From a paper:
Structural characterizations suggest that these long ligands interact with the MHC I molecule much like canonical peptides: The MHC I alpha chain forms a 10 x 25 angstrom groove in which peptide ligands are anchored by their second (P2) and C-terminal (PΩ) residues. Surprisingly, [name] ligands were significantly longer than existing structural models can accommodate, and a series of peptide analogs demonstrated that these longer peptides are not anchored to MHC I via their C-termini.
To determine how C-terminal extensions protrude from the F’ pocket of MHC I, we bound the extended ligand FVLELEPEWTVK (UFP16-27) and its binding core FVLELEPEWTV (UFP16-26) to [name]*02:01, crystallized these two complexes, and solved their structures at a resolution of 1.5 Å and 1.87Å, respectively. Both peptides bound in a zig-zag fashion in order to accommodate the core 11 amino acids in the antigen-binding groove. Electron density for both peptides was very well defined over the entire peptide length. When attention was shifted to the F- pocket of [name]*02:01, with the shorter peptide this pocket was closed by the side chains of Thr80 and Tyr84 with Lys146 of the MHC I providing a lid or cover above the F pocket thereby burying the peptide’s C-terminal 11th residue underneath. It was somewhat surprising that these extended ligands had Tm representative of canonical ligands, and more remarkable was that the thermostability of the binding cores was at least 10°C higher (YLSPIASPLLDGKSLR, ΔTm = 10°C, FVLELEPEWTVK ΔTm = 12°C) than their extended counterparts. The binding cores of these C-terminally extended peptides interacts with MHC I using the same peptide register of canonical MHC I binders.
Residue numbers in the entry:
A (entry chain B): 1 to 99
B (entry chain A): 1 to 274
C (entry chain C): 1 to 11
Write the structure that this text describes.
Amino acid sequence: IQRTPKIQVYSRHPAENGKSNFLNCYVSGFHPSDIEVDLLKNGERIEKVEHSDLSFSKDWSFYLLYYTEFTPTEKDEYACRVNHVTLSQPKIVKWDRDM
Amino acid sequence: GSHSMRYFFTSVSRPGRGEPRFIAVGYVDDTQFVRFDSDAASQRMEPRAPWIEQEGPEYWDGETRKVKAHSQTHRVDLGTLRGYYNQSEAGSHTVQRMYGCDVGSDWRFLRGYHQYAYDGKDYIALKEDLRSWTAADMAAQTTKHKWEAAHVAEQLRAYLEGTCVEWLRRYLENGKETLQRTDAPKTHMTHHAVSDHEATLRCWALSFYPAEITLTWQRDGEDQTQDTELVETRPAGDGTFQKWAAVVVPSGQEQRYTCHVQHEGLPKPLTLRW
Amino acid sequence: FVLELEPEWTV
């Protein structure tokens, strides 16, 4: 049983450029539990990143929240990068304010 | 509304060396309140909500002792299951266990559950009556017979109908300020133009608790599911939740469409319109 | 409050 992760990347609070916020990458629906999740700023790995304690849904698939403090701007690009046994290439999902 | 206490346990074997990775989490409704992680330094059940911190050293000793016993049970299980399924010592495998109780609005026992999985598939689960077992295959059938002979269901039922609900009630009172509070969704709509002829309306629900919510679109007062997208409800990271629902509409016809939000914190459902 | 999991209740 191998299930590929779903990924949402989003902010904790409504995004305003130049104002402090939290960047989230929610990964869900995956199995097995071993997974690599990075948050990126302009392609470079962000270092201070924390995550929730592993849990799972009714169908046994796992979910995790990865998160870090960030200040969005117009210039800077943020993304979440996920690798998992089900993926041949790493999956990169860019952060957009409207999603 | 109804309430629940649930524990989730994951054990992942580490074949090259050492004991399985073991992670345990406890929830009241959608609020995590305890954790254990075998990779962490404390080797204790740790608090993850302020309202549990008032529990004394005897609570933390008891919970640490029991959760360690769970990890050792899973360690044994992983060996047993490898044998049952004729698997080598080379691969990593996973045991998952979830149990807990639901209570209704009156805080009285509503239902109990205890479910077990091996490698992400159903293995054995306690039935709704808390007196019988659902075994998915012949391996789990062997387990069912063993657990019937040991009267596991009766003792689990006593916990699920008694102990579980008693402690749930206790936590609901001690954590009243957050656990008995509902946070209604903060709602708004955004508008995104794809072309001259097509536009996307997105209806947002933010900062809500508990996680249960319904977002639906209507066109001219009739439910519309075609040309809609509904994302999975997601944690904000401050204990609240987020969700959105979007619909694609002909440019200029935005006023036909209404978003409807249903949540415990809303006495009447909300209607939003562009 | 975690279940008192008895030692015999392995699979």
